Symmetry: C3
Subunit: 125 residues, 3 copies
């Protein structure tokens, strides 16, 4: 029910120019639907299912590098390696990286960040 | 130098509370947290504040997830040394509140994580 | 090799800025951060980008919290080794910007945290 493990965080753009969504709820459904498909497909391959909590956001960077004024519409995906389901943390990590790259490809993103953070998970069921 | 932060993820249980918007879910969960944190504070003098964020959680539809994700909330907070004198008792308190939130939101499962953090508090 | 991420939590000060939606607050804080980060970059060549999320912060009404929570914003960012040559200088830049944000948002207190993180950057 408790133990040291890893969480991940990925930040992606929503690519309005390609998908033409017009609200943050539409953007969340877009990214969430892609994550759902790729996570299920990898689960069928490796028996490792990576669930993700997805949050709306704006990412602020220099307008001279392409950022809209007041920020780019983005989505933050996070998840934790639950030892109830993950027997091998290194395989899970490699799965997350694989999914992050697939998300970057299918979202047509030029760059993407994927972070791993040490966490102590308490799981109540 | 280092302290802890927590992160809890819960469903919002629209079917039970009959809320109709993510804004209503935030007020619902906020009010529940506000009440349970106050109640615990009056027992132990340990107040656990929480930053609450809207979210969706994506998992396998075979396990009950709606297409594109379940509506969820993320609650986070930090053990501020200004207010916290015993980190172990603070962790116990977060866990106690996380279990109360799980019960009141009628959740079958719930995650509560602790992450090491370096807090700079400006006042 | 780990790097750092930061997390800042701030009020949105609806009463001072006369905003009436979370979207308006997000754009306002986003513009304020964009300006202070650009000005700092023009001096030090350290650009601190930030991912900003809407939120509500729940604390004791006895200390001034509104019922169900205060409207807040969470700003996070990562020290990407592709652009950050000196982590200490980056950390001091984040702290400097957090203090500027506190002043410009007219906040009485503000938290700024640093968390160790393993960053994979795909380009
Ligand atoms: N900090 C920096 N210092 C110096 N130059 C920079 C910096 N950032 C960007 N640049 C320039 O811009 C070019 C593109 O860089 P990049 O796409 O990485 O620049 C990114 C970061 O500045 C920021 N960002 C991304 N993930 C973040 C996270 N987890 N936390 C905080 N901020 C985040 O967001 C920027 C744009 C991304 N959101 C991607 C935008 C778009 N969807 C795309 O795919 O191209 C670089 O090659 C540089 O020339
Ligand atoms: N990763 C997995 N691998 C294998 N089987 C799984 C997995 N996840 C769920 N299952 C199956 O589904 C059953 C239910 O498991 P569980 O309720 O824990 O499955 C949860 C996780 O997959 C995901 N989730 C929850 N917290 C998360 C976090 N912090 N980060 C990332 N994802 C998070 O969300 C799922 C459902 C929860 N949101 C709760 C749903 C609902 N409100 C409820 O109370 O039952 C399990 O007994 C398994 O049979
Ligand atoms: N935990 C506590 N225990 C005991 N006394 C407390 C506590 N918190 C606040 N107080 C009392 O209230 C006064 C003000 O304290 P403070 O402004 O720090 O109290 C803050 C925290 O309780 C909470 N908060 C802020 N950042 C947070 C984070 N990252 N995670 C979780 N919660 C967060 O939010 C409270 C108010 C802030 N959002 C600022 C509100 C307002 N915008 C302002 O600028 O004054 C203190 O001097 C004490 O008298």
């Amino acid at each position: 029910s408790m133990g040291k493990t890893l969480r991940f965080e990925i930040v992606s753009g929503v690519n309005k120019g390609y998908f033409h969504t017009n609200s943050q709820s539409e953007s969340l459904d877009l990214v969430g639907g892609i994550w759902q498909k790729i996570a299920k497909e990898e689960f069928e391959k490796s028996n490792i299912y990576v669930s993700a909590v997805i949050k709306p956001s704006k990412t602020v960077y220099n307008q001279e590098w392409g950022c809209p004024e007041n920020g780019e519409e983005t989505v933050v995906l996070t998840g934790v390696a639950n030892e109830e389901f993950v027997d091998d943390i290194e395989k899970w990590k490699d799965t997350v990286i694989k999914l992050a790259k697939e998300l970057k490809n299918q979202m047509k993103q030029s760059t993407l960040t994927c972070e791993f953070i040490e966490t102590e998970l308490h799981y109540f069921k």
